[PDB]
Design a binder for this molecule. Structure first.
Ligand SMILES: [Cl-]
Ligand SMILES: [Cl-]
Length: 252
């Protein structure tokens, strides 16, 4: 497991993967002849393994950072990435009150939504956006993994802003700050973290690419929450402001 460093909390190797997803990743990883593409498609359904891979690929010597499993593969080679995939052989999970299935389901759905949204726009590369969507709240997984019993207490007594406040008290960090710190450790440049933080405001007025990407993130989040539960006038207005064709996003 990973040590919890109070000054600079950081989990990566120890984050769990879903049993079914791990089984399938291992199956493919042990397959005699698997493509880079098939392996990446499968691996990028898992926030834990995706993070580890990005972090490895972005570690100080390398050269430019990557933000998708397929780009990591091109950069460091399929054999190295395969090693990380086979490492699952060696969880999901200890935090009693944390809904892991819900977390994994929502993370993928959001990744998929953000990819579609950005695919019809010109802000960021959709494969990189997918990854950010996948990882947008990986800080939740990390707290649940690091402090399973303490975090179960928090989860039973609070949600929303009150949960954030409770996390700060117990851990001197919260799941959103932790996410940004993780994403920063794993190689993402600050504009992406800022766009993510922006996307979490009640209302996103900000101009520029950062504002537009933030509105795209906010839309992926709210749309994903909606299916897995229409959009408010504000969100529709923000949707219109990025420019949106609809409405295969509100279902499938
Ligand atoms: Cl440490
Ligand atoms: Cl604990």
């Amino acid at each position: 497991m990973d040590r919890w460093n109070m000054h600079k909390p950081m989990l990566c190797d120890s984050l769990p993967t879903a049993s079914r997803t791990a089984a399938a990743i291992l199956n493919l990883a042990q397959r005699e002849d698997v493509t880079a593409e098939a392996l990446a498609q499968l691996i990028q359904t898992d926030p834990a393994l995706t993070g580890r891979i990005l972090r490895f690929a972005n570690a100080p010597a390398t050269r430019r950072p990557v933000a998708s499993v397929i780009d990591a593969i091109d950069l460091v080679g399929l054999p190295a990435v395969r090693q990380f995939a086979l490492s699952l052989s060696l969880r999901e999970g200890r935090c009693e009150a944390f809904d892991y299935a819900a977390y994994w389901q929502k993370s993928l759905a959001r990744a998929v939504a953000l990819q579609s949204i950005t695919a019809q726009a010109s802000t960021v590369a959709p494969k990189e956006a997918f990854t950010l969507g996948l990882l947008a709240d990986v800080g939740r997984l990390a707290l649940a993994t690091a402090w399973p019993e303490e975090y179960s207490e928090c989860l039973r007594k609070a949600d929303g802003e009150a949960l954030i406040a409770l996390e700060r008290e117990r851990f001197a960090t919260d799941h959103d700050e932790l996410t940004r710190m993780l994403l920063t450790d794993w190689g993402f440049p600050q504009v992406f973290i800022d766009a993510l933080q922006l996307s979490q405001q009640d209302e996103i007025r900000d101009e520029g690419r950062t504002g537009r990407f933030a509105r795209q993130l906010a839309l992926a989040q709210h749309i994903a929450d909606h299916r897995l539960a229409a959009l408010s006038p504000l969100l529709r207005a923000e949707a219109r402001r990025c420019g949106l064709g609809d409405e295969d996003l509100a279902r499938l």
